[PDB]
Amino acid sequence: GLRQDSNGKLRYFDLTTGIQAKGQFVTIGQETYYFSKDHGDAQLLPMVTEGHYGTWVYRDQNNTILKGLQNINGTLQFFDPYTGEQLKGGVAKYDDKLFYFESGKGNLVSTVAGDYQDGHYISQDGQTRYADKQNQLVKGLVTVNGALQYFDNATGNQIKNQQVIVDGKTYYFDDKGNGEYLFTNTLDSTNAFSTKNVAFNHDSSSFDHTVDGFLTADTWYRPKSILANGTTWRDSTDKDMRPLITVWWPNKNVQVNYLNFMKANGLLTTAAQYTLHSDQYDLNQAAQDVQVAIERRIASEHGTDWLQKLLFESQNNNPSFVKQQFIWNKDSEYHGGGDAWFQGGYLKYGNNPLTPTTNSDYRQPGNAFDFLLANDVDNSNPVVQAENLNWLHYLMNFGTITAGQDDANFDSIRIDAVDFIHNDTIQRTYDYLRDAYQVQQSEAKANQHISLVEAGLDAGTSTIHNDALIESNLREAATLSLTNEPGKNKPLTNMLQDVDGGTLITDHTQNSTENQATPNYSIIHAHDKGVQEKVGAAITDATGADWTNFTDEQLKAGLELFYKDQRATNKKYNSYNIPSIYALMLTNKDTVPRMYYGDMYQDDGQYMANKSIYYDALVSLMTARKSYVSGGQTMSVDNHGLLKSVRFGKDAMTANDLGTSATRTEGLGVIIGNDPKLQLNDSDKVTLDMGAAHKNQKYRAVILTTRDGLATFNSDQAPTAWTNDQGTLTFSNQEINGQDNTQIRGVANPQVSGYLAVWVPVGASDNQDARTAATTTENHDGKVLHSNAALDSNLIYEGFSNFQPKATTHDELTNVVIAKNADVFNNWGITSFEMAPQYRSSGDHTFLDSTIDNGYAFTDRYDLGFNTPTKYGTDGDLRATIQALHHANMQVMADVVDNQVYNLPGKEVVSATRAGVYGNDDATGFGTQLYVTNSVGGGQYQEKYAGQYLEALKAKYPDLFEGKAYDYWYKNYANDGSNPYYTLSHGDRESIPADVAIKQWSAKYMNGTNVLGNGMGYVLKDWHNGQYFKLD
């Protein structure tokens, strides 16, 4: 061990190997020594005990900042010789050599071979290498321009994206070759003591807390022999179980910490200080002394329950011993990053020869995105694709199946997170609807099953044949030009055309055609879009909580503030110009608008109890839409910055068309301003060109801007204005004919920040309906939907909000109120009622969705409220709602969530790598490891209904079970800064079976999971050679 030479100087020889320590540190008993690299001569580093960290620097009991190398509390640290700043993630020179200090705590962990700042990277043989000042290849572990790196010793190739062991330390090098220290390895005990700790055998009965035959950090085991009472070696009985981490450790960091943890909990008495620089022999020896105290205490306690608590459970509000270790906690999982959109990011499943039950031949994303949250479903898998059809069929026949109630079935779907599931499942979904409802035959069939997706033109399987509507760019455009406070709005010229990354959806300026635009829906808000983050902000502000987890009382208080703010003229959290934006949505041509519940009602009340301040204006616009809105469209922005939008009325596509007798009392004009300080000169005129069908005609207001808000009129009893002989209405800063609120001027109030007026022609009959019926004309162009008058005649209603409170009675339940109010929706002209997703919430609080239980986060996707209600009602309440809506002549939309499942309690082991939403591998210290995942479960109703309809579907619609070639649009981003562009890709979906049900999920049917925080080394292996422990 420690020897003196003939000169009296001390030298050190490794206890296990005999090798002399030169140019390295060693901890002996309680002292830490350095041994010179030349002669191997000892040098005491005096322990620094008393003092503190501050500013980072370290001071002594004398309030003095320390400098250079220091031995602080069993760690060696370095502090700049001048500034005294602590080094972390870098090298310092000592004894004319280089040592690396890890980035966490700044502990000295290793020697580095050289420091290079005067070389050049080069490529040779498609590798990167580095050539030093003398043009020589650099080898080994080095720093280059201040970055730890490693080059293969034989070739000089820079290692990238791998873990590497160098001199018994393990490091990770990223995608750019930049390195970080992970842990220090155990050198190795060989002794007779340890050979009695070896496992009795490798059978499953000798181990517990195992998963799929793998060992975990929590595993207890039966050894060959037990040192009873700390004195007598005996044979183990089947009832002798001891923890594996009392006799074995994955790395030196854990073994050192374990010994220290046992010192602090009074199971090991020594003045010896244990560090990363302690000799392995001594560490091993000390662990054996701990066994002694443990066995002695087991005998005393007649049991092992104290040991369980000591090692594996929290203590004095501290994490357990296990959860204090890097490889067994989230720190070794490297959460976060720009692509980690929710839940700290993802783990992508792979294959391993030892995990045959979780391996997969699929797991291709088949779309732009892959991961989002919770357990991501592998919708490329044929068996999954079949189970997607089964679930889809269940929802489209939900009343039939659950109660033999044929008028209680969903008619249409929303594909949630469409870009996050494989295109084959999306195309197959569309063939199902083709086969069941013949939507491709004619617009009559298509418009009875209006479906939509959560995406724009990027949903290429949805645009290629317009099987469903995509979202227009209205939301975004309006967010630039109208939603903002005074001074922060852009000009309204961006509202003239609806454009998605440079591609045109429709142009409002001079729209006189049909079947040209991409079938789309326009919105401003949705349960998620433009709401949850602004409500989140007000909760956080009013209380303190984070926007995805908080109490119902905190929620309440946040909403109190949210609505006081929504009702004010000046708005910190809320959108400006909401009525105006709706005005545009409800009058624009070539769109199906979708109204948002939360723009008409307030979540500080039960469902539909508390009207919003916008209620009356949005009613008046819906009402006018049905009565008046048809024909072509013009739009322009005048030199005062006012947007002028006109619809001509049925049968008139342009300002010059004379129309028909229907045209006279149809059409309307909209005038919008986003500037509340607008004032016109006395001589200025604002003109709306109503068209040749509307010469010399009396008009009346639907909306007028007042000082305090908006006046709304749902009959011809309203202020009036006349067109001239050309069909032009003319406004100015004066009242028309002595009528208040007919002037144009900027106003700032709770409902408008700028200006809004809507005018319609006088003299419409009480029953006037401007809408156009779909024809049974056969389509020939291969498109399902077509953007024309008939499709524009539709109107969608998104019938929920995330932040509705829980119902306190049956009559307060959402679905009960909906049913009771069915006629109201029809009166407003709603043709499609988009219901919330009706699946029972997992209730796990791991995301916003499972905290307010909106129905997006669920375990059992067939459970739509049986026995006990969801947030919205029971299964009986849901049937009653679907029936009421149908009887009030509306379709009802099922929100189809194929992307993920939550809270699967059953455990499995699968290979995992860190990954972002794109399905891209992240380059992290975690690397690729076997991982214990929460991947098995589902629930009663899945067990009951999954796979049950497949044989019947196969008999009835064989084509869906076959493979099939298909086309779709692919959105290409150009790196050169210009706009994205679309190319025609081809797909070939696989055939799929009808005879394998997914009664419960498991990992072989999943792409991955959100990070769980178990750590890179929770599944136990030998880190010297990388082999997993696996039982028989």
Ligand SMILES: OC[C@H]1O[C@@H](O)[C@H](O)[C@@H](O)[C@@H]1O
């Ligand atoms: O745990 C904190 C840090 O520990 C360091 O030794 C590692 O190099 C880092 O990757 C890690 O973030």
Ligand SMILES: OC[C@H]1O[C@@H](O)[C@H](O)[C@@H](O)[C@@H]1O
């Ligand atoms: O040679 C004695 C000891 O030297 C220390 O510097 C190393 O960290 C140990 O692994 C080794 O056992």
Ligand SMILES: OC[C@H]1O[C@@H](O)[C@H](O)[C@@H](O)[C@@H]1O
């Ligand atoms: O785990 C429970 C049992 O474990 C054995 O190793 C001990 O000798 C018993 O006294 C103890 O009750």
Ligand SMILES: OC[C@H]1O[C@@H](O)[C@H](O)[C@@H](O)[C@@H]1O
């Ligand atoms: O409390 C003692 C018991 O703890 C459990 O958690 C372990 O799994 C058992 O093997 C052990 O016998």
Ligand SMILES: OC[C@H]1O[C@@H](O)[C@H](O)[C@@H](O)[C@@H]1O
């Ligand atoms: O793999 C298919 C996907 O790849 C992405 O690169 C494109 O942006 C998508 O439009 C396409 O669906």
Ligand SMILES: OC[C@H]1O[C@@H](O)[C@H](O)[C@@H](O)[C@@H]1O
């Ligand atoms: O499924 C997770 C998320 O996906 C989105 O597609 C939904 O609209 C959100 O409300 C949801 O929180």
Ligand SMILES: OC[C@H]1O[C@@H](O)[C@H](O)[C@@H](O)[C@@H]1O
């Ligand atoms: O390119 C922007 C597009 O992105 C999509 O995610 C949105 O749903 C569209 O409203 C928008 O037009």
Ligand SMILES: OC[C@H]1O[C@@H](O)[C@H](O)[C@@H](O)[C@@H]1O
């Ligand atoms: O709105 C629900 C409808 O369901 C029907 O079966 C009832 O018999 C009607 O009275 C009712 O109009």
Ligand SMILES: OC[C@H]1O[C@@H](O)[C@H](O)[C@@H](O)[C@@H]1O
């Ligand atoms: O209730 C659904 C309604 O949707 C419309 O778009 C259909 O084309 C109408 O025939 C139907 O009355």
Ligand SMILES: OC[C@H]1O[C@H](O)[C@H](O)[C@@H](O)[C@@H]1O
């Ligand atoms: O220029 C610095 C970069 O050059 C090279 O591309 C290397 O691969 C990378 O290690 C380095 O950071």
Ligand SMILES: [Ca+2]
């Ligand atoms: Ca996915």
